[model samples]
Target: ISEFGSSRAGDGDMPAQTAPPTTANLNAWLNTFYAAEEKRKTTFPAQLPPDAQPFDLLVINICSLSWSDVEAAGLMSHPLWSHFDILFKHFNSGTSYSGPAAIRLLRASCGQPSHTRLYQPANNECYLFDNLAKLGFTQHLMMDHNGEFGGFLKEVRENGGMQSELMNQSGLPTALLSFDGSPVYDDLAVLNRWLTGEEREANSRSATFFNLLPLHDGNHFPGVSKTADYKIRAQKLFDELDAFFTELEKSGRKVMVVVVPEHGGALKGDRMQISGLRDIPSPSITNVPAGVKFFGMKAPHEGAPIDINQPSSYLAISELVVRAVDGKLFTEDSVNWNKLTSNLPQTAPVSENANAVVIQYQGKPYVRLNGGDWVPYPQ
Candidate 1:
């Protein structure tokens, strides 16, 4: 757990207590955090300037890839990490499941909302795709696998407010089989098809929200058993994604590519939760590797990726996009990394899945399950 800005101990919002927090105080802190966050909002531009450069925005919502899993698999130095110009080293997905994580990301234009508020309708400004659409970016949805399980596609549409029809994936060959035995399509192929079909005419920008699930738990190899090795699966996915990034570079079209994971695979489950189980959204499952890469831009970031160490969530992502639009990032040759990320929203980790919730207080993780008292989560 990292320092939570402004409200943590020594910040005067709450005094450092030597004794354990009483149940009432713990509940009060939780309540205050939620109320403060609900009031925090990231305003998106209603429309872009007339002369703003048009570039495609790709939000690759990956499933089951977390920083903890990356380190566990010894892939911290993979080439995939070098693909982004802006990397979030401490980004929290705020949830452990695909549906809730996706919805949270889609509604990232505003502050982090409670899990229950996810089902309810939100203000128009909170919808990320809607904000992009208003700025002349056409919305497109793509997924490598059938979104039939757990009504994934339906929830994305209804809760996330994505009204566009999902891109066709009928003839693509099977890459892997999901835990539920659904065919998973090749990610590169799916992305290639979309790129080939893209008509990036003058002033015509598009934003695609694509979901890739190769690293998800229980995904069977084509000729192997149901339980595929995590390292093998992860490498294959990263390799394909790397190749896709090369394809984008070779196409010579300007695109703002944002890759964010839905949650971790829970590859090495902690004592509180079994391996491959995500009943509780611990930091291992919520803190993920998220990044942004700009391709074919006139002026691009020249050095290594800028790392944001702040404890941040989806709101930071929204702030980045808004800043990029305001800064005309596509046309700028040199970017001040500090200026770009300075003062970006810092969100203390608060992960929730239905009756289960996990939050960080004073740099310590706590969990409340089944509406029970807050207890220290096993690290």
Candidate 2:
């Protein structure tokens, strides 16, 4: 799911080696969209701990997997429960693409993932997987990734490994590339192999890490048939996961799984249509005024909208996922947004989303209202 963007016209076959996405609010956009017709106010769950904790902690790393993609996957009903759509009209992917999302999952505080930070005896805070390994959790992280978008490690590696750790994570890409599969040849087997922890791994205990993306590089157009495009590709993905969840339930393990949706949207005719941009704005992203490369989305051409409620950065959701399965939930929103975001170097809390890991970039924050032709994220 790394190269979720489609190649712009005339670029032909090369991958879109552009900048990644940004993050922002989702609830406001939901309210804006359903204002007249539905009139139901949509907001994210309280950052406060749940009265009773609940739990994939289901990340959709591909772009534009909105309601349309959900429906297209033949998931409109039945076994398919629902989407963050009920919780978010539009949510931020936090950073640009799958790599960032992967990194986010490895970090702190998505679901108030504060307690899971893998503190280094050296650097202090590292990804959750590495930390969990220290806690005796055999990591079963997997990815149904593709090789076409092939160079994520190159990009992360280029950023100077660990000089900026998030930018240079070696473990994640190694996992994504190694187990990369088309629906993972034998997911349960792989899970058992990794979970069982041979004479090899860290002595084996509670296996904690898990990630599944449906054949990233090859999940897009022309790689498969018209009937089995990315939409179908993702639908079948839900099928794979559903069975996996069933198996876990049948295993009778008390382990909990959580569903968190971010980065989604399928490629159409070489045009990239992202649903929401969560990081800071840039010229190369789908919307914005200047560099608008792909130009549309089922959520687009309205430029991009910000989530005043909370930035929908995958990092945030990743933190959410990590903490959820670890049996933790947030009761605090004290973190400074300035520290989290790269572009905005100062904290501006006067206009923070009331219930968010909030922010207000630059001067005026961009937001959507009433489902109107969106004013969009102004650069």
Candidate 3:
């Protein structure tokens, strides 16, 4: 499955309007976080090619799965075993392909004098695999990683992709194993252990062969406080992958593995208000002391900055933060932050926990400390 922070939801909530923090301070904080993340890059795993395989099974743990990854791993468009099945998770804005889209894309990409297969519809599934067969593969398996709907490890286990079942029934052993250390899910270790035990039992009864995809560094959203130690996290993931490979090989299974991260994290921006300060002159706002800066505008913006002092400004800034992190930014022709706050989703009532209370403002979500309900984000 794909790792954490790769989903569209990982962009977090956006502020409808926000008062921009002082640019200087915001830039400073962003740069600091970026530099810190860069420094941790060296600890991540590197990518490897799909060739040079000697094992029966391959396992890969990675940060993110991209279209290029499927090709680079020598998995896609191959004549032999080209019909192999796929169980994948769709994160962020990525789409899940099961029908004609897969077949059509494969057909268009394969064959001599590659013809454009524009006849395929967006959601087509049958045509996709039909094209695969024409490309040379007779059979293949594919499924989405929706967990409840036969995704993630469940699909692999149920579909007979797991090594234990294959070894016991087919006596062919594992050829490859792969996984990405996804922080969003907490059951990886459990699944890995179960597979490991099953493989051992199978091997004791008969000889099995296997191969592993390289284990790669994984990523988590920077917003998660638990990710402060990048090296530790990478190392732990590597250790888990390493153990799996070592155990399989010890059982007389030949295996090879590779690993890497999908992409790096971006700088974290501060949430603020923009609309409340529109009437305030720009230069007059210069040299303003460190705090939130709201750049008011004539009209409402999707992610406008608003004055924090006003209650209506909450939605604007929250929505703005979400959009900004999602790569949406304010421009001259765009709606200003001030006007946006007025149209924010309605705030929901708070639910209290031991340490904090969850509250929804303008249909946006936020958390406050149990004792400090007045503070938006209790420090």
Candidate 4:
């Protein structure tokens, strides 16, 4: 009765099967063999920073924006909060986990290993925002809800082997934005008429994936309930995204943003905690209930805070935000999450390689799979 059919326990879920979140689900609890993403190697920027400033890469997916709502959303005394780059990293679990399987497990061999069994975003065409829309960029996606109803855009479009939403345009193109309400004045008036007078250059790289809604709509205690100040309703959508990125930098153009947050909320009973504060950094990521917040990237990893133990899921922070917008930014110890989950079917030959077997979960130890190297558990 439990296997894929729900109820054997309480009031809840877990269905879809073949879409690629394997080792079989809750992103396989991700011990990833206690390795940091196949040694985290990121290489692609041979050039583009000499004066590097042709922006327009917004990803502001402020969903469940944690890190204690970026320290109670006064957001470091605003004023573009020094154009934020604050990400402390290591956010493993949040509301158990999902947010469209943490951005469809941000690929480049979406490393996984460890086992818990909750599932979502079953996969398609190896995603890194669909491989940066095949590296040309020009990705656009919008969301206010009806993302197919279920955690994280219903696990990336309820197993249709989706193409791309959260990639742009509700219900079409890359698919997942079946436009509903959730936010418009605070933001998403068709993404402010698609960023109003939007324009980009530096070889035409464009991406807009705005999904805002009072920090994941009401339930999981989005304040308005008890001891509020839960960042007072996401500081009014972070002060209207600081006047929507200051009217997209006064249309001078040269923008690149990545304020990510797919998980990081918890507090039940009058709900609100956001993990053991006191300006958190560690204690294995303090008081975590539903924690997974490490927002900031796209610009020299400008927020710079990575030691690399690797569990930045949202597919390793969307493979470091498509390699920091392809100007090459990999300092999270540069790959080795057990050499990409012990290199199965050999690190992606068409994807699909995680039946796994070290006796399928400890019965013996000294572990040997010959490669893809993951060794955490019973340690």
Best by lDDT: 1
Q: Model 3, stretches more than 4 Å misplaced?
A: 1-55, 64-194, 197-228, 256-379
- Error at 250, model 4, angstroms: 4.6
lDDT of 3 at 275: 20
Query: What tens digits encode model 4's per-residue C-alpha lDDT throughout 1-379?
Result: 7568867557501122233333343234233432543343333343445544333566655444544445544454544445444332434422223343244334323444222222334233344454555555666665554455455565544432334555334432211112232322335344456655364233455655655544543432322233334466565555666676666546544555656554444322111223322111111222121211122222233332223333233344444454456433322434333332321221110011122223223222112223345332221
Query: TM-score rank, highest first?
Result: 1, 2, 4, 3
Where model 1 places Cα greater than 4 Å from the true spot, the runs are 1-20, 200-203
RMSD versus native structure for model 2: 17.7
Q: Backbone collision count in every prediction?
A: 1, 30, 89, 41
CA lDDT of each prediction against the hidden true structure: 0.85, 0.32, 0.26, 0.39
**Per-residue alpha-carbon lDDT of candidate 1 for residues 1-379, written as tens digits (9 for 90 to 100):** 3476456588422223344566666677767777777777778766777778777888999999999899989999999898788899889998999999999999998888889999999998898889988877789999998899889999999999998898999889788989888999999899899888775354568888999888888888777875888998888888998999999989888788899999999988789888888878999999999998988877777778889887888988888888866437777767676787688888877899998888777688888987789898998
Query: Number of clashing pairs, model 1?
Result: 1
Better of 2 and 4 by lDDT: 4
Question: Which whole-number lDDT from 0 to 100 does residue 345 have in model 4?
Answer: 20
Record all residue pairs in model 1 with backbone atoms less than 3 Å apart, i.e. clashing. 299-333
Cand. 2 TM to true fold: 0.44
Candidate RMSDs in Å, in order, are 4.2, 17.7, 23.9, 19.7
Structural similarity to truth (TM-score) of each candidate: 0.92, 0.44, 0.24, 0.28
Give the range of the ten consecutive residues with the poorest summed lDDT in model 2: 288-297
Quote the lDDT for 378 in model 2.
47
368 Cα displacement, candidate 4 (Å): 23
The lDDT, on a scale of 0 to 1, for candidate 1 is 0.85
